[PDB]
Paper text:
Here, we used cellular and biophysical methods to investigate the molecular interaction between the G9C8 TCR and the native insulin B chain 10-mer peptide, 15LYLVCGERGF24 (G9GF) and 9-mer peptide, 15LYLVCGERG23 (G9G) as well as a heteroclitic form of the peptide, LYLVCGERV (G9V), presented by H-2Kd. We solved the atomic structures of each of the peptides in complex with H-2Kd, demonstrating the peptide residues that interact with the MHC binding groove and identifying the solvent-exposed residues that are most likely to contact the TCR. H-2Kd is unusual compared with the binding motif for most other mouse alleles (that have an anchor at position 5 and the C terminus) in that it anchors at positions 2 and the C terminus, reminiscent of most human peptide-MHC binding motifs.
G9V was designed to improve MHC stability and has been shown to activate G9C8-like T-cells more strongly than the native G9G peptide, although the molecular basis for this increased potency has not been fully resolved. H-2Kd·G9G crystallized in space group P1, and H-2Kd·G9V crystallized in two distinct space groups, P1 and P1 21 1 (only the P1 data set is shown here in detail), which showed identical features (data not shown). The G9G and G9V structures featured unambiguous density around the peptides, which were presented in an extended conformation, primarily anchored at peptide residues 2 and 9, with Cys-5 acting as a secondary anchor in the center of the peptide and residues 6–8 extending away from the groove. Consistent with our previous findings, the lack of an optimal anchor at the C terminus of the G9GF and G9G peptides had a large negative effect on their stability compared with G9V, which showed a melting temperature over 20 °C higher than G9G and G9GF. G9G made 17 vdWs and 4 HBs, and G9V made 21 vdWs and 4 HBs, both through peptide residue 9. Although G9G only lost four vdW contacts with anchor residue Gly-9 compared with G9V (anchor residue Val-9), there were knock-on effects at the N terminus of the peptide. The first 5 residues of G9V made 102 vdWs and 12 HBs with the MHC binding groove, whereas the first 5 residues of G9G only made 102 vdWs and 9 HBs. The G9C8 TCR bound to the non-native H-2Kd·G9V with a comparatively strong affinity (KD = 13.6 μm). Importantly, the G9C8 T-cell did not express an inherently weak binding TCR, because peptide substitution of Gly to Val at position 9 resulted in anti-viral-like affinity.
Residue numbers in the entry:
A (entry chain A): 0 to 276
B (entry chain C): 1 to 9
C (entry chain B): 0 to 99
The structure:
């Protein structure tokens, strides 16, 4: 139902001295993580991180594991390589990241495909949205960019982002359908917190919802007032569901005038909430 | 499905 | 290079009731590089068997982790999350406040 994403976040962090680089691959579908590879692991393999993946057979794991190993090596080289291009000391730790995968719409039309890299916290080179041309962040990345045009890799990542990524996202949402296609409506309520003779804080809580997308508004007598409102970032509960709140400071004794409004995919219409002595 | 990197940096 | 400092939230999985079993979370996001020390404290002492999720990152390359433990909140027991990171000169303590 609606748009979906299959995303992989890969991180390689070099340790000159201290042993080989650390390399981590973690996979998500939408807001939900489903797989991991981690190089520091006693027995380093590609693993499930969502019970429904234990459905997929042993050659998948073995094949994913192996594919994850080539990249550990690729990232080993690409780090020494990058260390030279930037003319850095041999004894500094540094970070390569890579994100890739596909966003499709409800009709499985590829909305956008990704294959992008960062180095030490900044964009390094990215495959553009056309899936044919590359964007380099700086002249160092020009060196890399030229190899990849020359080797023609754009077409190898494109066919994947237009093909496998998408046909496999379809398959994973099939496997974990009773989690990934679910909706958990927010459990929501309004708390009152005195402060001074002049103010009190009202806080509007949305708990235990899925997917992560939510919008909490505060209104005064039926008019909007999002200006003058504290709100925390959406945060994970730890059980696969999310939490968010929005608070407003209001004058003592005017509490009943305010309405928090909660909007989620799970709710048949928005919730209006009002604090009640 | 994990797609490996082709040519190196 | 661009380093980014951690953004921290401390909170319970469920709304707190004294004596009722729960989970304490410290969500640490918006930081780069990935290396980071996080600890849950109970009256200032480190709690054992703290767990964290797999190291991951957001559209802007910044990392995030959730640390968590089983706990039973209590009237007098102070809980806090203590984070250190290359971009800080001293660790940050954020105390858990059941109302946030």
């Amino acid at each position: 139902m609606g748009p979906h994403s299959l995303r992989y976040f890969v991180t390689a962090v070099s340790r000159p001295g201290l042993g080989e680089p650390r390399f981590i691959a973690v996979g998500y579908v939408d807001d939900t993580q489903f797989v991991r590879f981690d190089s520091d692991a006693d027995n380093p393999r590609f693993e499930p991180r969502a019970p429904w993946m234990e459905q997929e057979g042993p050659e998948y794991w073995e094949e994913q594991t192996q594919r994850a190993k080539s990249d550990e090596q690729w990232f080993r080289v690409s780090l020494r390589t990058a260390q030279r291009y930037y003319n850095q000391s041999k004894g500094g730790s540094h970070t390569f990241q890579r994100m890739f995968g596909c966003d499709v719409g409800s009709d499985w039309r590829l909305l956008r495909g990704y294959h992008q890299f960062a180095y030490d916290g900044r964009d390094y080179i990215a495959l553009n949205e056309d899936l044919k041309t590359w964007t380099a962040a700086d002249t160092a990345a020009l060196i890399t960019r030229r190899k990849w045009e020359q080797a023609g890799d754009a077409e190898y990542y494109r066919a994947y982002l237009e093909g496998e990524c998408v046909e496999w996202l379809r398959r994973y949402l099939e496997l974990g359908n009773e989690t990934l296609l679910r909706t958990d409506s927010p459990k929501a309520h309004v708390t009152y917190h005195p402060r001074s003779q002049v103010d009190v804080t009202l806080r509007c809580w949305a708990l235990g919802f899925y997917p992560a997308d939510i919008t909490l508004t505060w209104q005064l007598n039926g008019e909007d007032l999002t200006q003058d409102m504290e709100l925390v970032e959406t945060r994970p509960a730890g059980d696969g569901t999310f939490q968010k709140w929005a608070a407003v400071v209001v004058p003592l004794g005017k509490e009943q005038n305010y309405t928090c409004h909660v909007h989620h995919k799970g709710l048949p219409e928005p919730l209006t909430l009002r604090w009640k002595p | 499905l994990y797609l490996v990197c082709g040519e190196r940096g | 290079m661009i380093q980014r400092t951690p953004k921290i939230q401390v909170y319970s999985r469920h709304p707190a009731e004294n004596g009722k079993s729960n989970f304490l979370n410290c969500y640490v996001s918006g930081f780069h590089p990935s290396d980071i020390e996080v600890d849950l404290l109970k009256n200032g002492e480190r709690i054992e068997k703290v767990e964290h999720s797999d190291l991951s990152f957001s559209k802007d390359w910044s990392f995030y982790l959730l640390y968590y433990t089983e706990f039973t909140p209590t009237e007098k027991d102070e809980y806090a999350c203590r984070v250190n990171h290359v971009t800080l000169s001293q660790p940050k303590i954020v105390k858990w406040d059941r109302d946030m």
